[PDB]
Design a protein around this nucleic acid. Structure first.
Ligand SMILES: *O[C@H]1C[C@H](n2cnc3c(N)ncnc32)O[C@@H]1CO
Ligand SMILES: *O[C@H]1C[C@H](n2cc(C)c(=O)[nH]c2=O)O[C@@H]1CO
Length: 95
DNA sequence: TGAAAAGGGAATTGG
DNA sequence: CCAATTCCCTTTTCA
């Protein structure tokens, strides 16, 4: 009996779709899947991610961005050439 | 002028 | 052994 936990891209996509923590992350170009983190309030979302996963240490945005870097391999999220800006693969977005 | 932002290697670990 | 987590290292920017 192995318990399921959220993946980072799901956590973030759920935040965006529901308009939660809109002070910490927001759509920049929603039709294109492009979103961006708040420069001042991103660590609050980071801590919320750590709690969500029940990790032993406090989650910081450095460790969160470090995690996002690995998605370059599988392609669910890529970094965009804009400050604290990222992009979801379009197969995660409606038509 | 140092915090922030951007990369990175790799050992680790819950499940 | 995935899917991050954790820790540490770098360079570049600019507020
Ligand atoms: O101690 C040096 C460096 C520091 N300082 C702060 N902001 C600076 C900019 N924009 N250019 C150069 N030096 C900067 O103050 C002293 C120089 O005035
Ligand atoms: O492919 C490897 C790793 C895999 N493995 C090992 C262990 C200890 C575990 O808990 N899960 C798991 O999938 O088994 C193969 C042999 O070690």
């Amino acid at each position: 009996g192995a318990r399921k936990k959220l993946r980072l891209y799901q956590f973030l996509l759920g935040l965006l779709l529901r308009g939660d923590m809109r002070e910490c992350v927001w759509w920049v170009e929603p039709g294109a899947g492009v979103f961006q983190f708040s420069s001042k309030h991103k660590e609050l979302l980071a801590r919320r991610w750590g709690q969500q996963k029940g990790n032993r240490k406090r989650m910081t945005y450095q460790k969160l961005a470090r995690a996002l870097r690995n998605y370059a391999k599988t392609g669910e999220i890529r970094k965009v050439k804009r400050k604290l800006t990222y992009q979801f693969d379009s197969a995660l977005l409606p038509a």
